[PDB]
Structure formats: structure tokens, C-alpha cells
């Protein structure tokens, strides 16, 4: 189900090539024949508008699109009824006979789950959760628990809903805690780091992603190259260079992951340039990471500017720690940028107290302000010490 949501997401924003939309349309047309995408197929016009979202022959009549395959017709209307009779009408009649004959226990619960998964592809979520809720009481061990969690896990990836999914996934996992192997636990662990990108948790996302394996592929839930970009980009932003040398840049799987596909451009272009402290070619890597990684990915396109703006602030901190002073002529020219471009980035960073530095105008020397023995007891002990005392006085001043 994720293969369609990944390819059709390129239909939303394409600023360069038109063929990217037609190439991604070939994967959509192939999957809609085997499985009915009608809930997401109708969600195409309800997601992003004023591109392809105005083209429909049924609910709303307008023609504006670069893709004519997303509009209903007489063929898809007949196929919608054929898939609805086989996956629901034909299967429910056989399950109804098993209910009266009393055949098995978990077999009827698993049959309701497989039947409930078909309502998700027809576009009716009321009967999908109704048949799933009846089979939830029959779940005891991890045999029927994986299938119940699998249906709710689809709600997050297929319907792109971060609200009612995680609340249900946590309730099912916390009811009976076993986990089976480590891969069945990834469904809760991988979606955890993915949900952190919606509410912008930053370093919290990479907690379970860095320790996760790079060979994990959920197919219909997620692809191989999609999860590879989530752990590479978020893991690089979380762990500092101290932890990058013993984990990211040197790993048995990660070194094998970068050679599989060239669509990462994170653990190779960004990591080596950061480890070698080469700022000449490091700047164009951020543009390739933004265009060819962040934009095509689903959850990596939500932040947008929040990647390059924050990553550029931290890469300067690695340079400020290795020198007391610097050269403004070398930073604003030799690294591939201009003078006005450097003052715009550092202009917003200084008043936010995100770093300690000394910028020179006439002399043109970038000097680092080093606390020496001050460290974390200088401005943090007074701010965090007295700041928490303000929260302590909240309930003590007003009582109840």
C-alpha cells in the first residue's frame, strides 16, 4: 500500500521534471488493478489541490491535470464492484457458515482480520474497525496480536493519519507485552521514529532508528530505500561527531547500505565532508540532499527548510571548537558562498543564543567564545535552576 503513496506523492510537488509524474503513474496504474486503491485513489483529490486534484468525473467536475489516470470512468466503476463482491460479499458468506458450525477459535478471529483488511481497500473504515474490534477480544497470544496491530499500522501509512493510529498501536502493545522477535517490535519502533517527524521531535526520532537494522523492509508498509533515508538523515542530525565516528561512518550495514543505492547522499556526502572538515564541496551536498531526498520522501518533506537551516548551524560548531579564531575572507569566499549570504544565516543564529562566537567587521576574523571551565555551570545553572523554581511556585502560590 506504501508503493502507491510513495510514487503518487511525487505528483504533489515536482519543480524540475514532468516525466517524474508520468513514471510514478506507471506504478500506480499497476497496483490499482490487483488491489483496489479507491480510499487512497479518492484521497488523491482530497490531499493536494490545484495540480491534479481538480480532475474527477464523478463527485466534482473540473479538468486540470498532468495525469489523466486519476479520474473515475466506466471501467474503474465496474472493477470497484467486482473487488467489493469477491473480498467482502463472497468471503463473508463463507465466514457466516463457519460461525454457525463453530469451527475453531483463532481461525475465525484471523478470518475476521483478513476480511477487515479488505474493507480498508474498499474505502469503508467503519466496518474495517468493527470487524477488527470483534476479533480484538479473541486475541491473547502474539499469534492474533500481530494481525490486529497490522490493520491499525496500515492506517498510519496508507491514510497518512498520525492522530488515531499511534494511540491504538500503543494500547494493543501495552495490553500484552511480548514482542516476539525484534522485527515484529519494529512496527512499534519504526512508526515511533516516523511519528516524531510529524510533531517535530528531532533527536527523539533517531533513538530507535540508529539502533535499527538497515535491511528492514516491510514491503506494503514501507520500502527498502524509504526507510534507509529516514535513519540516515535523522541519525546524522541527532548524534554529534563524537558518536558519528564509532557508529554511523563505520558500520557493517550502513557501509553496505550506501553502496546499494545512490539516493541516500547522507552517510556518504554529508558525513565524510563533516569528518574531513571540507566545506568547499559540503555546501552543494545540502542542495542534493534537499531536492533528491527530502522532497521525494513523504515524512522528510514536512520539515523542508528545518533541515538545511539547522544542519548548517551545527556544522559551524564543529569548526568553532577546533579554532579560537578564523578568517572571514576564507569563510565568506573560499568556501563557495558570498559575504551577504553568510551574514543572513548567522544573522538569525546569534540573537537566539544557539552558539558562542565573535564576528568581526573591519578586521574580518571569526573568533570562537570558549567558556573554558565554565561549561554547563555558567548560564545553564542559573537559567535551569531558577527556571524550574518558577514552575515550582505555580502550584504553591495559587494552591488549588
Amino acid at each position: 500500500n506504501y508503493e502507491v503513496s510513495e510514487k503518487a506523492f511525487l505528483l504533489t510537488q515536482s519543480k524540475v521534471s514532468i516525466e517524474q509524474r508520468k513514471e510514478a503513474a506507471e506504478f500506480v496504474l499497476a497496483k490499482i488493478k490487483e488491489e483496489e486503491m479507491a480510499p487512497y485513489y479518492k484521497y488523491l483529490c482530497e490531499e493536494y489541490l490545484v495540480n491534479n486534484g481538480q480532475s474527477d468525473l464523478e463527485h466534482d467536475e473540473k479538468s486540470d491535470s498532468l495525469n489523466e489516470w486519476i479520474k473515475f470512468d466506466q471501467e474503474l466503476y465496474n472493477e470497484l464492484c467486482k473487488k467489493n463482491e469477491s473480498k467482502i460479499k463472497e468471503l463473508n458468506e463463507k465466514i457466516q457458515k463457519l460461525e454457525e458450525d463453530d469451527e475453531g477459535e483463532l481461525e475465525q478471529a484471523q478470518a475476521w482480520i483478513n476480511l477487515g483488511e479488505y474493507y480498508a481497500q474498499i474505502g469503508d473504515k467503519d466496518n474495517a474497525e468493527k470487524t477488527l474490534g470483534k476479533s480484538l477480544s479473541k486475541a491473547i497470544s502474539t499469534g492474533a496480536k500481530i494481525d490486529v496491530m497490522l490493520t491499525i499500522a496500515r492506517l498510519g501509512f496508507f491514510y497518512n493519519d498520525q492522530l488515531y493510529v499511534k494511540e491504538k498501536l500503543e494500547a494493543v502493545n501495552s495490553m500484552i507485552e511480548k514482542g516476539g522477535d525484534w522485527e515484529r517490535r519494529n512496527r512499534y519502533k519504526t512508526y515511533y521514529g516516523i511519528h516524531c517527524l510529524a510533531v517535530r521531535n528531532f533527536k527523539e526520532a533517531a533513538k530507535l532508528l540508529v539502533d535499527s537494522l538497515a535491511t528492514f523492509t516491510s514491503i506494503e508498509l514501507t520500502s527498502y530505500e524509504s526507510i534507509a533515508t529516514y535513519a540516515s538523515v535523522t541519525g546524522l542530525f541527532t548524534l554529534e561527531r563524537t558518536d558519528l565516528k564509532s557508529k554511523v561512518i563505520d558500520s557493517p550495514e550502513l557501509l553496505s547500505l550506501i553502496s546499494t543505492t545512490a539516493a541516500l547522499q547522507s552517510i556518504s556526502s554529508l558525513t565524510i565532508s563533516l569528518y574531513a572538515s571540507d566545506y568547499a564541496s559540503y555546501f552543494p551536498y545540502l542542495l542534493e540532499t534537499y531536492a533528491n531526498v527530502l522532497i521525494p520522501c513523504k515524512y522528510l518533506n514536512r520539515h523542508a527548510d528545518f533541515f538545511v537551516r539547522e544542519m548548517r548551524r551545527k556544522v559551524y560548531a564543529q569548526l568553532l571548537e577546533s579554532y579560537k579564531t578564523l578568517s572571514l575572507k576564507s569563510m565568506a569566499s573560499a568556501f563557495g558562498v558570498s559575504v551577504a549570504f553568510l551574514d543572513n544565516d548567522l544573522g538569525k543564529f546569534i540573537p537566539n543564543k544557539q552558539l558562542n562566537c565573535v564576528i568581526d567587521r573591519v578586521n574580518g576574523i571569526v573568533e570562537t567564545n570558549r567558556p573554558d571551565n565554565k561549561n554547563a555551570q555558567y548560564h545553564l545553572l542559573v537559567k535551569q535552576g531558577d527556571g524550574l523554581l518558577t514552575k515550582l511556585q505555580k502550584y504553591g502560590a495559587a494552591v488549588r
Binding site: 552543494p284 542542495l287 534537499y290 523542508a304 563557495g336 558562498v337 549570504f341 544565516d345
Partner: peptide, 19 residues
Amino acid sequence: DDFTNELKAELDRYKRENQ
């Protein structure tokens, strides 16, 4: 935004490579 950072990076590359 991305339009500001990408524009200033490409315009400087044309001038820097000509020096």
C-alpha cells in the same frame, strides 16, 4: 527559504570560478 539559499549559492559559483 530554499529559494534564497539556493540562489545565492549558484550566483557566487559563477563569479568564484571566473576568478
